[PDB]
Structures are given as structure tokens and as C-alpha cells.
Amino acid sequence: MGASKLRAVLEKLKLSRDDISTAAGMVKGVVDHLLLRLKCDSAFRGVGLLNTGSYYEHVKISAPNEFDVMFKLEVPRIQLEEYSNTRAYYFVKFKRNPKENPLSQFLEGEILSASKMLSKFRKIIKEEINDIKDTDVIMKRKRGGSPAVTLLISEKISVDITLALESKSSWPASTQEGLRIQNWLSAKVRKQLRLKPFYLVPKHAKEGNGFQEETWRLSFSHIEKEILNNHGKSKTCCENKEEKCCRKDCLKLMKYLLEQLKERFKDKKHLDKFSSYHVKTAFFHVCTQNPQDSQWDRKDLGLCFDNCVTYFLQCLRTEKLENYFIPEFNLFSSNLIDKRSKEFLTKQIEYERNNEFPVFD
Ligand SMILES: c1ccc(-c2ncccn2)nc1
Ligand SMILES: [Zn+2]
């Protein structure tokens, strides 16, 4: 494509940081008061803020009125029960025998109910947003699954609040062959990263005709954040002029491509199933394929970008996009996304690439 064109796109994209940060401030305030009022309840005592997502990864673009926050909650001594070889969805039981468990009320049998937890969560949040008349914050009717609550700050800002269980235990076995960063960020880093906790968000699993509503999906957004904000083989990568790479620029460009394409065909349902996480996952795989900083030279911004696109396209055609942490978990399976959508997105991206990306202007 050429470096300078994409770079112009990146300038135009860079112009929104001030506004996005300004809204992020208000979000921060509201969420702060919320968490302050949430820790009162015995069930959500050890609840806290989890600073992950596009904003904290410094890759959020062109959506200042939309934010996603995650609330983490420490669940000690838990036992995970894998659902139907899905490798990613789990039942949360408790290995702890005493009734000292603060989540006993949400225990539907030996298994911890996600429905009860989410219900109490939404209830407490509703009461606490009703309690405050200082700021103009209102909840929203239930729609999505993983985004538990949806808030509206003033009558402009929109915040998606997600709840996540935190486990300081060692990661599930399905993550064993994942996080292939050995040749990129070193085995040492992979080793110390796996010593960090893992998270679980309430997400129902698709069987085909019905959905299991009492399951939890693995989450490693903190690991994604760490990797993105420390992305080079060199520790001083992007800390001086001679060591400037174009990884994050490529990620931004991909995210922007998908956003613009989703916007152009928004009156249909073809691209509704695709999200930024797909793009990010593909990006991480490309990073694994090209572990050297010299393969991400600034002047090569064009080629690199194409690389990403190319790989993404491949994932579309072969209907295979492995989760970066859970290899046997396929984000692009026919169960999750139908062939027609993938072929449509392939068609569009290929057109764009064949005509110097007119969607970038
Ligand atoms: C954080 C954000 C999104 C996701 C996800 N999005 C779509 C399909 C599967 N996972 N996972 C983690
Ligand atoms: Zn770098």
C-alpha cells in the first residue's frame, strides 16, 4: 500500500485521543463511585476495577462515546468443570467445604449459578445508580450476555460493564499449548505471565438449538494488555528512534478497516458477527509468525499491514481462527459464524486491498 498513505490514516486516527480520554475521565468517576458502593455487599466485597480493553492498550479509535469496563472479583479455592470438550467454557464449583463462601446464595447445587450472580449484580448496580442524582447515569434493559450491565453517562456516554471471576490458581489445561510467545517475548516471560491469575466471564455456550446459561468462559485480557504494552523482542523497543516498530499501528489499521467495513454495510447483518477481538487474535498470531523486531520495521509498515490482512483473509477462507490462549478453541468455526458472512467479508477486504483501500478516506 505504501507507508505514507497508511500513516496519514494513522494521523487522522490519532486526532481523537484527547476526546476519548476526556470521556474516559467521566467513565472513571462513575465507575469509581459504583465500585465504592458495590464493595459494601457481602457477595461483591472483594470486587475491583480491571484496567483492560482497547483504551488501556492505547489502541482505542473513533468511538469516544462507547466504553467497556470489567469488574474483577476474587473467587478463592474453586474447582473448574469443563463443558463438553469446549475447552473454553467451564462450570464453577467450589473446592472449599466450609459455608464461609460469600457466594453460597448463588450456588444452584454444587455448581455456581451465573444467572443468580448476574441478577444480584444488575440489581445492586440499579439501586446504586438510582441512589445518585449528582451525575446523570442510567442503566439499560438487558440484551447481551457477557456485557452484563449497560450504562449511560449523561445522555451521551455509553459504558458496557462486565463481571469477571478472578482465579489465582494455575491456568486450565486447555491453555497449555497456547500463548506461543517463546520465540517472540521469550520463555521466561511466558513463564512469569502464566503465574498471573486467569479470569472467567459469564457466557452461555451455543449447542445448536439451545444454550447452556450457567457457564463461564476464560478471559486473559490482562495478558493481552501486558503483551501489547510490551510487545518487542527488545526491551527498549519503541523507546528510541532507531527501535521504532509498527506492530500497534498495524493493529490500529486492522481494527479501523473492520470498523469502517462494519459501518459501510451496517444496514445488513453480514458483518455483525465479527468483532475487534478477531482482528486482535489474528494480530497476535501474526506476531508469533514474525517474532523479530526487524520484521516490524517502521519503513515496512505497508508490507507488515498486508501480512496481517493476508493472514486474516486466510483465517476467513479456511474458517479457522484459534484463540491465542486456547488453541483448540476456534473463533471462526461454522458453529459461531456462517460461511456466507466470512465469504462476504473476504470479498470486501479483497476489494479494498485491490483498490488501495478507498475505505481509508
Ligand atoms: C475479550 C473480548 C472479546 C472476546 C471474544 N469475542 C468474541 C468471541 C470470543 N471472545 N474475548 C475476550
Ligand atoms: Zn515496538
From Swiss-Prot:
Q: Give, from the UniProt record, the effect of changing residue 252 to R.
A: Loss of ubiquitination by MARCHF8
Q: What is the effect of changing residue 169 to A?
A: Slightly decreased interaction with histones H2A and H2B
Q: Where is this site: Arginine-anchor?
A: 96
Q: What is its main location?
A: nucleus
Annotated residues for binding of ATP:
54, 66-68, 221-224, 255, 276-280
Q: What is the effect of changing residue 15 to N?
A: Strongly reduces enzyme activity and stimulation of interferon production
Query: Which tissues is this protein detected in according to the database?
Result: Expressed in the monocytic cell line THP1.
Mutation effect (residue 233 to Q):
Acetylation-mimetic mutant; no effect
List residues traversing the bilayer.
none
Q: Using the UniProt entry, state the residues involved in the cross-link Glycyl lysine isopeptide (Lys-Gly) (interchain with G-Cter in SUMO), renumbered to this chain.
A: 72, 188, 225, 235, 320
EC category name? transferase
Residues bearing PTM (Microbial infection) Deamidated asparagine: 51, 230
- Quaternary structure and interacting proteins, as annotated: Monomer in the absence of DNA. Homodimer in presence of dsDNA: forms a 2:2 dimer with two enzymes binding to two DNA molecules. Interacts with nucleosomes; interaction is mainly mediated via histones H2A and H2B and inactivates the nucleotidyltransferase activity by blocking DNA-binding and subsequent activation. Interacts with PQBP1 (via WW domain). Interacts with TRIM14; this interaction recruits USP14, leading to deubiquitinate and stabilize CGAS and promote type I interferon production. Interacts with ZCCHC3; promoting sensing of dsDNA by CGAS.
Instruction: Give a short account of what the protein does.
Output: Nucleotidyltransferase that catalyzes the formation of cyclic GMP-AMP (2',3'-cGAMP) from ATP and GTP and plays a key role in innate immunity. Catalysis involves both the formation of a 2',5' phosphodiester linkage at the GpA step and the formation of a 3',5' phosphodiester linkage at the ApG step, producing c[G(2',5')pA(3',5')p].
Q: Give the protein's recorded name.
A: Cyclic GMP-AMP synthase
Placed within the complete protein, the shown segment runs: 161 to 520 of 522
